[PDB]
Amino acid sequence: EYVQFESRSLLSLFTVGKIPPVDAAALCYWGEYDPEMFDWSRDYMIENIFENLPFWTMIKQTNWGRIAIIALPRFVSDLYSNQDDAVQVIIEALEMAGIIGAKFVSLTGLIPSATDYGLAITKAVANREDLPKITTGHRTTGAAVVLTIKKICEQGGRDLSTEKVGFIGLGSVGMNVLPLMLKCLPHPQEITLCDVYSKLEFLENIEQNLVHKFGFKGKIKLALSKTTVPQEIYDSTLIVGATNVANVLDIMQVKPGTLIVDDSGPHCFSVEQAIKRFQEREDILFSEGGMLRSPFPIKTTVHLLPSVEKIMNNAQKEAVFNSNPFNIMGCAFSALLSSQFEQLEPTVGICDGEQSELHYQILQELEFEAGDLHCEHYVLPAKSIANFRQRFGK
Amino acid sequence: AEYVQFESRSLLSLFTVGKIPPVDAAALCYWGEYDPEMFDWSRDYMIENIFENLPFWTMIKQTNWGRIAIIALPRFVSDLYSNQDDAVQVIIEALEMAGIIGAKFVSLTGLIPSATDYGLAITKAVANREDLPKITTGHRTTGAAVVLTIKKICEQGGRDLSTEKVGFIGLGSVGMNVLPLMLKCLPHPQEITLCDVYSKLEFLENIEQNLVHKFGFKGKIKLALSKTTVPQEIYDSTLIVGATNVANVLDIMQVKPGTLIVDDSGPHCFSVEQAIKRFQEREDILFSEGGMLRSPFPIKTTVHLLPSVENSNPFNIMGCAFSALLSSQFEQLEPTVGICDGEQSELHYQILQELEFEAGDLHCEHYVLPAKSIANFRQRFGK
Ligand SMILES: NC(=O)c1ccc[n+]([C@@H]2O[C@H](COP(=O)([O-])OP(=O)(O)OC[C@H]3O[C@@H](n4cnc5c(N)ncnc54)[C@H](O)[C@@H]3O)[C@@H](O)[C@H]2O)c1
Numbered sequence: 001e002y003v004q005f006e007s008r009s010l011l012s013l014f015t016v017g018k019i020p021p022v023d024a025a026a027l028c029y030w031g032e033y034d035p036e037m038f039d040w041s042r043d044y045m046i047e048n049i050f051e052n053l054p055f056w057t058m059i060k061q062t063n064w065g066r067i068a069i070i071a072l073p074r075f076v077s078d079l080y081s082n083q084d085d086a087v088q089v090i091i092e093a094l095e096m097a098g099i100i101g102a103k104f105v106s107l108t109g110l111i112p113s114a115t116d117y118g119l120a121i122t123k124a125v126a127n128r129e130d131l132p133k134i135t136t137g138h139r140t141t142g143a144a145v146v147l148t149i150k151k152i153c154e155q156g157g158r159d160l161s162t163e164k165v166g167f168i169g170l171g172s173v174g175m176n177v178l179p180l181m182l183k184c185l186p187h188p189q190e191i192t193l194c195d196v197y198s199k200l201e202f203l204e205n206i207e208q209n210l211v212h213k214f215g216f217k218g219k220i221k222l223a224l225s226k227t228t229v230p231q232e233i234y235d236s237t238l239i240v241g242a243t244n245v246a247n248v249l250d251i252m253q254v255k256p257g258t259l260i261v262d263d264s265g266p267h268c269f270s271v272e273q274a275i276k277r278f279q280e281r282e283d284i285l286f287s288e289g290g291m292l293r294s295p296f297p298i299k300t301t302v303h304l305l306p307s308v309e310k311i312m313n314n315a316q317k318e319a320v321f322n323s324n325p326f327n328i329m330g331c332a333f334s335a336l337l338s339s340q341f342e343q344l345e346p347t348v349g350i351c352d353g354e355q356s357e358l359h360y361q362i363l364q365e366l367e368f369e370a371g372d373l374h375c376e377h378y379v380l381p382a383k384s385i386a387n388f389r390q391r392f393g394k
Numbered sequence: 395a396e397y398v399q400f401e402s403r404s405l406l407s408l409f410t411v412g413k414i415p416p417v418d419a420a421a422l423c424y425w426g427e428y429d430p431e432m433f434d435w436s437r438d439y440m441i442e443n444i445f446e447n448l449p450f451w452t453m454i455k456q457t458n459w460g461r462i463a464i465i466a467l468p469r470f471v472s473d474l475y476s477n478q479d480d481a482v483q484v485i486i487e488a489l490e491m492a493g494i495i496g497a498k499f500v501s502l503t504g505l506i507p508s509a510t511d512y513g514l515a516i517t518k519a520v521a522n523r524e525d526l527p528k529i530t531t532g533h534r535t536t537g538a539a540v541v542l543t544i545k546k547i548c549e550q551g552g553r554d555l556s557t558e559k560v561g562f563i564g565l566g567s568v569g570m571n572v573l574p575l576m577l578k579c580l581p582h583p584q585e586i587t588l589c590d591v592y593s594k595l596e597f598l599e600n601i602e603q604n605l606v607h608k609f610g611f612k613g614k615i616k617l618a619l620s621k622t623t624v625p626q627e628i629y630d631s632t633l634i635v636g637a638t639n640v641a642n643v644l645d646i647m648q649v650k651p652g653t654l655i656v657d658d659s660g661p662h663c664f665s666v667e668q669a670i671k672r673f674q675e676r677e678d679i680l681f682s683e684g685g686m687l688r689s690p691f692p693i694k695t696t697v698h699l700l701p702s703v704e705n706s707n708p709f710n711i712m713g714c715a716f717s718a719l720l721s722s723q724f725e726q727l728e729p730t731v732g733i734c735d736g737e738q739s740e741l742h743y744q745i746l747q748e749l750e751f752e753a754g755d756l757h758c759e760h761y762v763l764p765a766k767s768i769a770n771f772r773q774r775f776g777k
């Protein structure tokens with residue numbers, strides 16, 4: 001009903017006037033390359049499967065405008081391995097996005113992390129006026145994570161003021177979330193800051209700002225990761241993830257009663273292990289952190305890459321047809337917010353991010369909340385959440 | 395292979411990312427005629443599953459005077475004549491795509507003008523839309539190409555046009571561009587026969603009066619109507635100029651030895667297979683396409699074949715399609731919609747001569763007439 005498959009090219013349908021222009025776009029990529037998961041080399045897949053071209057695969061029609069979802073013809077490791085090439089393929093996708101009407105384009109996933117948070121792109125297109133404006137969307141993502149912290153505490157039957165909160169990954173998203181959480185939600189009793197060893201001095205400065213600028217009066221701890229998080233992180237009762245490295249947290253070692261909000265993509269813990277533990281014990285709550293729930297249903301048009309349409313053609317793989325029609329990622333929705341509300345300026349670079357409050361406030365005014373607790377394909381059943389709340393609430 | 399490049403990826407996609415430049419003009423074509431015997435699938439299966447009811451940008455012709463996109467409508471020719479409303483609808487969808495990729499003018503090739511009131515049904519449906527490119531039938535440039543082919547086929551056959559008995563088969567939009575232009579630019583022939591269907595008799599009689607009282611033709615004029623196939627009187631002509639919208643109305647096996655045949659009809663008004671077979675055995679006719687131009691420079695062609703559907707002379711370009719480029723580069727060459735007068739046709743002829751264009755080398759569809767066999771014809775039947 002709210003999800004429709006389109007076998008014909010969206011680009012073709014647009015150029016003949018059969019579908020209207022969009023107001024915004026969001027750029028994504030084709031996950032990660034693993035030679036043991038595909039029949040072909042990385043170069044073969046880029047040239048012959050992705051055709052070295054951006055691919056317009058989805059339209060999300062919201063109450064606040066239409067967003068095109070456009071996949072770059074790259075894997076995430078390609079973006080990190082040659083920034084010049086990443087910027088060039090992004091500029092190619094921006095030209096397509098402008099033709100189909102986008103005024104603002106969000107850089108989803110790890111594209112900001114790989115492109116100096118967009119600054120490498122804006123420098124390369126400074127001599128052009130024919131392209132949409134770019135945004136990392138991280139202020140909206142930060143607002144979505146804070147909404148999810150609020151939601152997961154409510155669903156768990158606990159107040160944030162009694163939690164010991166562990167932040168795993170204090171990069172662009174993580175440092176949007178932490179100040180906004182302190183500004184908008186009750187302060188927890190303890191905060192642990194966890195990142196890699198080379199960022200010790202960076203974390204020490206955050207600790208100073210926590211005391212003197214954000215007004216945090218609780219206990220502050222620093223925890224340095226090597227290949228995985230240190231064991232002290234498992235003393236936390238609420239874990240907030242935003243890493244660029246998968247599987248650094250062992251979900252089987254979190255204590256019963258722990259709440260986990262994770263914006264990392266791929267997740268900083270094993271999704272399959274989390275689902276298994278939850279189904280067997282119902283003693284954690286865990287969720288994506290970046291997903292918003294719109295008050296109005298969203299109409300999604302899906303055009304699969306004809307390769308994927310045939311191989312990933314399980315009749316049950318049409319879980320797309322049944323994905324929640326109220327959900328939209330905050331990063332992608334940020335491009336619509338910047339076009340609806342001029343004060344929500346696009347973000348490029350590491351930004352001061354106190355304007356994250358403006359994103360949180362406008363989402364609250366529009367009656368957005370965090371998406372219902374879920375992790376990738378798996379929705380946590382409401383009765384199982386109630387069982388957790390009965391046992392581990394306060 | 396230096397001038398024809400095959401592209402595996404969508405030209406539309408390549409354009410939208412800036413990998414290929416915009417075009418200056420476009421030309422709309424269609425997928426020929428649907429033969430149920432030859433084809434394996436059905437008509438609706440190919441329209442909905444193979445063409446996807448979408449126009450298909452299949453070629454780019456890079457010339458010394460700009461780039462033209464060749465765009466195939468998702469229809470067969472019989473679909474255009476039977477349903478003018480649907481034809482105009484898919485044409486307007488193709489025009490929107492053509493505008494996006496840069497085309498300022500769009501030629502309506504083949505039988506598209508004949509099936510759409512020569513473009514008037516299109517201009518009526520676009521109404522007050524001000525974003526689409528301008529359409530042209532291109533028939534003034536087609537007419538110039540035919541006159542250039544008449545000149546060339548008499549050059550190579552060793553024949554003088556002033557002594558020929560010329561028979562025109564089909565006096566529609568193209569035919570009535572060719573006839574006045576031939577008289578204006580070439581030596582007047584000895585005799586002209588006008589042949590069209592029975593119901594256009596009064597129309598042909600009016601042409602006859604214009605030949606004597608407007609165009610100053612002093613030779614013999616004869617009218618010969620068709621009921622189905624052409625009348626026997628047409629085979630008395632030594633030069634036959636064809637421009638019909640019906641195939642196989644002229645029997646190539648009944649033309650007299652030494653006959654020259656210039657045919658712009660598509661499909662041709664005679665059997666091409668029988669024409670090639672007779673030429674190789676007897677070498678007693680010269681026959682050629684009439685609408686094909688020869689550029690002085692080789693044209694680079696990019697070809698993107700439609701996947702489900704999936705040796706040209708690099709100097710050759712059809713006059714109809716090239717007309718869209720001419721209108722985009724020369725403001726004085728106005729586009730043609732409807733049945734227009736033939737005064738401006740000399741402008742197209744003079745510009746093509748100025749650009750060192752001539753008619754394509756004698757050929758019919760895929761078959762090229764070997765220059766040695768042309769010399770033999772000039773030996774046996776060349777005045
Ligand atoms: N789905 C979306 O559209 C979307 C939008 C925004 C962010 N994200 C996801 O959020 C996550 C963070 O994005 P970002 O721009 O802030 O990236 P970032 O590169 O700026 O920050 C990542 C942080 O993770 C830290 N980290 C790496 N290994 C670690 C370990 N073993 N222990 C603790 N910390 C470690 C890094 O040192 C770094 O500080 C990414 O996975 C990204 O894909 C997804």
Ligand SMILES: NC(=O)c1ccc[n+]([C@@H]2O[C@H](COP(=O)([O-])OP(=O)(O)OC[C@H]3O[C@@H](n4cnc5c(N)ncnc54)[C@H](O)[C@@H]3O)[C@@H](O)[C@H]2O)c1
Binds near residue numbers: 504620622639660
């Ligand atoms: N390849 C190209 O791009 C291109 C461009 C222009 C014209 N053409 C071809 O030229 C031909 C004519 O085009 P047009 O716009 O002038 O079409 P038209 O409909 O205006 O004229 C066709 C004429 O042929 C006549 N005719 C039909 N049956 C006849 C018969 N049995 N005997 C004598 N005359 C007969 C019609 O009555 C009609 O007057 C078409 O086949 C068309 O496809 C091709």
